[PDB]
Ligand binder design. Structure first.
Ligand SMILES: NC(=O)c1ccc[n+]([C@@H]2O[C@H](COP(=O)([O-])OP(=O)(O)OC[C@H]3O[C@@H](n4cnc5c(N)ncnc54)[C@H](O)[C@@H]3O)[C@@H](O)[C@H]2O)c1
Ligand SMILES: NC(=O)c1ccc[n+]([C@@H]2O[C@H](COP(=O)([O-])OP(=O)(O)OC[C@H]3O[C@@H](n4cnc5c(N)ncnc54)[C@H](O)[C@@H]3O)[C@@H](O)[C@H]2O)c1
Lengths: 297, 297
């Protein structure tokens, strides 16, 4: 079948595209290359440079399933204007749903986020916890989920919403690990750290997403939201230490809408698919620093 | 203080404006006159014809509180294109929140809807029930609430979201009562009916909204969602009968994303404000038919 992956030139999307291609699917990538890169696109995939903010972004594009992963990256949320978060998340997602409805797409796998929970009352956070986002980005992802669930109920466009915790690995060009490497690249002797969160290596995240999608296609529920992340967490200061050692540096650490604590409960995912993380958060962070060192140092 | 009422030239908005004016507030109406009418605007209010779909709709407009009541009317939801529901509800509401944030508005009273609940599992429906909208309009109102609650938590723009059941009274130009009158006007001998819902006379709805707003301004919770509607309900066929009698007609009834059953639990509203409806649903429908008969027959 034909699978459309929006944001397929980006970090998670490009790895997801690689796995779908390895599994034999005909993959179509749609990406505006705002944060993604043509170098990350699998040679076997068909790239279409379109902007999802345009209602007509999908003219001529057909697929049976769409993995809607396009969005501005979840980083430095307070420094981007709210209208950018709104347009790149809510308007883009609505436009994807209208294209899905009008072209008869059967399934939307939406890349959601732990940010829809905001500063959760319960941690590890189960899927039942309410939307209490504290960033415009978080509100935008929650609104996207509400719209997806409604299109599933009303138009039969089924949706699996994957709420990701932090995902890390090769090709990453945003986030705390990338930031620390770039800071040490600027000055290897000092590292400025301005939090405890769960990190999943991208290989694990893609496996979990695809295993969940497979099970979802075997279910008949119109909509399902599922957390995808690791079972543990690491503190920002530990990330800082791991990155330094990978680089063989001994920097002087200097402390100088963002959710402070996050860890999603992944009991539903594990129960539904048998999936298990293959690396701890600390291990996912170390491998990623090693991956990025070769790409950025 | 200065109060801005978007959609103040419309049905609920014009009556809300009348009461705010009667209470002494300086009222500014912003409305694009798409479904509202200049004839409904209180002479004491200041009218600005602007379109909330424009990010800059509020240039030059200042207020301490905004009653955001503008939206396309909640009617014949399945016959309007989804993008219209999306733009008139989600984009407009986001633009109102950005203007509120940038101009330092302290409170947003958002006109939400029973449709955010979809076909509720529990009826009368308490505020705790989840968003399960089945219409794009319902999804749009729920997304609007999520964005409002986030702006309250993040930017301090407090929000009272009023989830209305059906509101009826003078100036109404949409909905089942209006439709039946216009149908009988076309042919007084036959009435085609294509449901059980709660109806509140507009005077009651405006009183409840303002009493809730007063209490909300005395609270410190950033966000509060409150149901506003009657305690009982009437069936479509009863509405049909009431309208006929008001008109002195004896028509032959002929049965030929829309929520089928709705009644909101108003325990929280009554507890918080002491408010009580002054007319039953059947009485609100009869008075409205009498009001509309003079305006339309
Ligand atoms: N990486 C994480 O830890 C993480 C965490 C939570 C959620 N997510 C979600 O996963 C998805 C991918 O994130 P990512 O980390 O890979 O970020 P990314 O920036 O690398 O990938 C996003 C891709 O979408 C593309 N894109 C953005 N706007 C577009 C538009 N208007 N039209 C077309 N393409 C557009 C970008 O160019 C980019 O290639 C996003 O939806 C994001 O919210 C990621
Ligand atoms: N009447 C009901 O029973 C009911 C039920 C549930 C919710 N509501 C809500 O109450 C509010 C008012 O509804 P109503 O019944 O009075 O409908 P209405 O159509 O009479 O009033 C809506 C007003 O908003 C204005 N408007 C629409 N789009 C606009 C835009 N883009 N820019 C500026 N102005 C715009 C319209 O011209 C109109 O005057 C809405 O938000 C609606 O969802 C009403």
């Amino acid at each position: 079948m034909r699978i459309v992956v929006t944001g397929g030139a980006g970090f998670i999307g490009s790895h997801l595209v690689d796995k779908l291609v390895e599994l034999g699917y005909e993959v179509v990538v749609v990406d505006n290359l705002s944060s993604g890169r043509r170098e990350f696109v699998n040679p076997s995939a068909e790239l279409h440079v379109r902007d999802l903010k345009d209602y007509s972004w999908g003219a001529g594009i057909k697929g049976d399933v769409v993995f809607h992963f396009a969005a501005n990256p979840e980083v430095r949320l307070s420094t981007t204007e709210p209208i950018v978060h709104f347009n790149e998340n809510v308007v883009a997602t609505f436009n994807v749903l209208e294209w899905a409805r009008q072209t008869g797409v059967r399934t939307v796998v939406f890349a959601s986020s732990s940010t829809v929970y905001g500063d959760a009352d319960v941690i590890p956070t189960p899927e039942e916890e309410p939307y209490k986002p504290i960033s415009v980005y978080g509100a935008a992802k929650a609104a996207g989920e509400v719209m997806c669930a409604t299109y599933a109920r009303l138009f039969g466009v089924r949706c699996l919403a994957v709420r990701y915790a932090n995902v890390v690995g090769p090709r990453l060009r945003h986030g705390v690990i990338y930031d620390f490497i770039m800071k040490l690249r600027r000055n290897p002797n000092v590292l400025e750290v301005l939090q405890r969160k769960s990190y999943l290596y991208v290989r694990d995240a893609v496996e979990a997403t695809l295993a969940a999608w497979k099970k979802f296609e075997e279910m008949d529920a119109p909509f399902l939201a599922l957390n995808v992340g690791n079972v543990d967490a690491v503190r920002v200061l530990d990330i800082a230490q791991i990155v330094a050692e990978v680089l063989g540096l001994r920097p002087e650490i200097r402390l100088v809408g963002d959710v402070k604590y996050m860890t999603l409960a992944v009991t539903k995912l594990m129960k539904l698919t048998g999936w298990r993380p293959t690396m701890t958060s600390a291990e996912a962070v170390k491998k990623t620093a090693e991956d990025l060192a070769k790409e950025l140092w």
